[PDB]
Amino acid sequence: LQLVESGGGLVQPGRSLKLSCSASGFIFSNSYMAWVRQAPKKGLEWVATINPSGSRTYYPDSVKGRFTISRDTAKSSLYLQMNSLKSEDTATYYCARHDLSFDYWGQGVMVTVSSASTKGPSVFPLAPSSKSTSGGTAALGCLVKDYFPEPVTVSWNSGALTSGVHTFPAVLQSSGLYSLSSVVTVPSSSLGTQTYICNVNHKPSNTKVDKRVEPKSC
Amino acid sequence: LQLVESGGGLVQPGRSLKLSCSASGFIFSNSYMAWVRQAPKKGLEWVATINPSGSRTYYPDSVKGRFTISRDTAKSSLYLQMNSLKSEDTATYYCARHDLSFDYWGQGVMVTVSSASTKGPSVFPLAPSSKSTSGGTAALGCLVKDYFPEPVTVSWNSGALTSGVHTFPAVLQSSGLYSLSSVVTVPSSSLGTQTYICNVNHKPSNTKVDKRVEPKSC
Amino acid sequence: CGPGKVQNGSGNNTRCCSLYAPGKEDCPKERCICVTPEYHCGDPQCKICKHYPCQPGQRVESQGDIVFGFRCVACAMGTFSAGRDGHCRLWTNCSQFGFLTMFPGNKTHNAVCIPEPL
Amino acid sequence: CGPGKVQNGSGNNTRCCSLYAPGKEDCPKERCICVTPEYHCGDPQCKICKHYPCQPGQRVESQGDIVFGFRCVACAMGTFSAGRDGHCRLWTNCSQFGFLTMFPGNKTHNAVCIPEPL
Amino acid sequence: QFTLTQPKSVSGSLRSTITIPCDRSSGGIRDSYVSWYQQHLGRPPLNVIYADDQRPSEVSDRFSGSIDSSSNSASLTITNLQMDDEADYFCQSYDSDFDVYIFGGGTKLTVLGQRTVAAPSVFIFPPSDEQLKSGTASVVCLLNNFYPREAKVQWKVDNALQSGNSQESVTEQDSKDSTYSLSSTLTLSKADYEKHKVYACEVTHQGLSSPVTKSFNRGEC
Amino acid sequence: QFTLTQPKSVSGSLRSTITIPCDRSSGGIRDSYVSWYQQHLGRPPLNVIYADDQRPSEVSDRFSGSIDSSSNSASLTITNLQMDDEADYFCQSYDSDFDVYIFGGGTKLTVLGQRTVAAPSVFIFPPSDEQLKSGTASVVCLLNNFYPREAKVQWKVDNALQSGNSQESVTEQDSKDSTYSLSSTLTLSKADYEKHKVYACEVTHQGLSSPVTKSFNRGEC
């Protein structure tokens, strides 16, 4: 069985989208079919139900009157006509089949409802402690702050430095903008002599930055 | 509704053929479909049954284990895979549809399973009586004997003589060869002065004969 | 005919059909029985009702996959038929209805009932 | 299960699917009612039998179009149920069987019968 | 279990009831579809009745079927017989799952015309000298322009009736005079032919007051 | 209708038995039905049980469901816990026609691995002068290479505990040392940042004998 969702993307508040789920794989019109969503990092929320004939539809609440589900045997496709979208409708949307109990599921398509616009990040140093005792470990990094949409890529010294590197998952701030940090732990004895540059690319905004990070002075 | 049989012909004893019946015309896969045969001049003998799905095959007896029936919606065609053919399988084979009771039928395709192969006829005179009383009617003709396969054509005086002409149906002899007679009734007073020639063509053997027929003498 | 079943035909072609169980597969569709007595489906789809009477203690078997031939076979065990119609009706279990059974019944005849004497 | 109906499953998944199947093969046989007491179909197709007991004078309603939820509603008028199984069996009309009725019956209890004083 | 029987032929006047009986022949399953089919010339069969009655559309109401007697006895009735109803008629049945499908043997229905005085002109042809050289002798008897079709043609060779060594061919009915013509061919070996003297064709037909013999002696002129 | 409550999480050793209890909550008809769905990484949910038990094929017999208590209490039992059973577990419910389909809040199942393999290296980063020019100050605390995942990171600014103005990000588990790393970012306005002196990150973790504080004074070096 294979289910492939499509038609998700970035959309303004108050706009509309139509998701599609292509199937075959089983007995499409000979089974029920569901939509379910999930905000990244959060729980599953059930979203839709279409009768196998397609005669009747069933929905939950927060989207009743705004969304729509239907089927077309032509290419085993579902029809999530989502209207009047709000920030709370931002989520990964999955298709699957209620048949007996959600038999198979797709990989999901991300819907992002945002007043936020394509914005490039600023790149700030997370500077290693100047007062670090020689013979231990120091940490340094780059803070990549205030960007939209995802994703941003971070490498260190053009990919030549990979051991001790931790590039954290992006966090959505209450501003609607993403921020992420990349850090690396290095010998404190290397701080005077090894250059450390984080290479940041936010391709959605055309923003490319190389940031040298070193001990702050006075 | 139109049903067209094809794939019949002349075949050696112990050989195989495949008949086809093209249809559309109705609801092919949405109906049963039959094969029935008939020796020329004899009765109808039921021969094949195919499930509309094609899942099950039903056969009579003299051909069970030797014949085969199947369907392919592609072009609404039937599949009479006839194997190990014998002289008794020589017949016109018709397709039709058992639906409710043999709804529509084709024109039929002739299968000839014979030993004796192509052979041209000999043409013999059927001579008018020499002793015929002048003022009555005399009969004369041509006997076209010992040919295979059918057909032979007979005309008289290159088609200029047609009244009083009777060209009989061919008869299959116990030898496996056909024979036929053509006759014409003429004024007995014309026997001395009008020439009578039968023009015989057996195109399957390349045999073409003009035979002058007149009163036998002494 | 009946509220949750489908009337088709009139007079002697009177029959009732069940939903075609459109679920899936290709087994069959519109299984219909005919209402007029001693009349039975002639085709598997029951397009027309035909006449083939039986006797008591017999049902009507119907072999054929396009047009039926009819064999008047006897009633199965656990069933009866007291008419010429040739349908094996099930025995009336008096116990599950409220009563006891005075005569148990056989192929010819269904069971009569006896009660609770209090 | 029964002669003119289709047995499916074993143990607690036992099914008395009616709708026969026109004596075919892997047809879409349906209309099944679990025989196991207090067990009921879980899906509309009755693929699996689930457990949801009721009390006397109640039946088991089953709302849902793929997987059932269960409400233990009371017995309809004209019916009864004297067990936890939750099936509305019809009243035993003693009059059509041979007897009169001593106590008429209600939702909790079926009728009993007083015959013909011989 | 397979069986079915029909009368070889039935002849009736125009505008007259025609009854073609189909008998179960001990099958015992008197009631089931007993379809009736009609075959003309070398054309395919046409379904006249399926389901015992309920004639399909087009076929004339004059064709009706019935399954009475129940003592094994379907019947096809043609009321008010017409000239276009000349044909072989076939009944076909069931056993669709009892075992096999089967047609009856067919019944020939012939129409009526002026046949009382429609006698054949009768001719006999000896075998030719050119045929006798190839080792075979064919003796031909011709019956020309007769009605009805029913004729009896008998070959005698030195008084002995010949049987199993002759074959007949009959023309279809003429479109102008409504007659038939018939050729009968007696075939012998040359060696058999040269044993005997008198070769005779005897023709019995309704339009002949007594049988007509045409004959020759071998080796005369 | 609207109910179904699940515990937040549990940590269990390999080979142990973990029971995840999906409390019906105002279940009423608790026995109506239950299903268990399993979610790993950013992958789609996998159905582990539909119909209360009868695990679909593939899922390991070690997953079993039961609906006992009847006092509102379905449960998913994982016997003999394996390392590939780390995942959020969800209990889908019924109400298919009672009103609408519903899903529980999920339960996180963590595995006990090499416990206390390492204690977190704790670092604090002040906001940069370049960020302070744009009107905002971000203070970052890093916890490096620790196990288990459970840590408590608290921000103090001039003794005041900060709440609602910070955000955390945690790496997925390292594929070589099996540790986690965590960044916590405290965000203030520049004007708020310049009011206060002492900025501190306090880290409580199982591998630390007592909480570790990392701090700086604003405007020092």
Numbering used by the authors:
A (entry chain H), B (entry chain I): 21 to 238
C (entry chain B), D (entry chain A): 29 to 146
E (entry chain M), F (entry chain L): 20 to 240
Source paper text:
The glucocorticoid-induced TNF receptor (GITR) is a prominent member of this family because of its central role in regulating T cells to promote immune responses. The receptor is a transmembrane protein expressed on the surface of multiple immune cell types including activated effector T cells and is constitutively expressed on regulatory T (Treg) cells. Interaction between ligand and receptor occurs at the cell-cell interface and is proposed to generate the formation of high-order GITR arrays that trigger an intracellular signaling cascade.
To investigate the structure of full-length mGITR, it was necessary to generate protein of sufficient quality and quantity for single-particle cryo-EM. It was also important to fluorescently monitor mGITR during purification and for later biochemical experiments so we fused the receptor to enhanced green fluorescent protein (EGFP) at its C terminus (mGITRegfp). The structure of mGITRegfp/DTA-1 Fab was solved using single-particle cryo-EM and initially refined to a resolution of ~6 Å. Analysis of the mGITR dimer shows that each subunit forms a crescent shape, with one dimerization interface proximal to the membrane and the other interface at the apical loops, which are distal to the membrane. The mGITR/DTA-1 structure showed that DTA-1 binds an exposed patch on the mGITR ectodomain that is entirely on CRD2. Results on mGITR-swap showed that the mutant loses the ability to bind DTA-1.
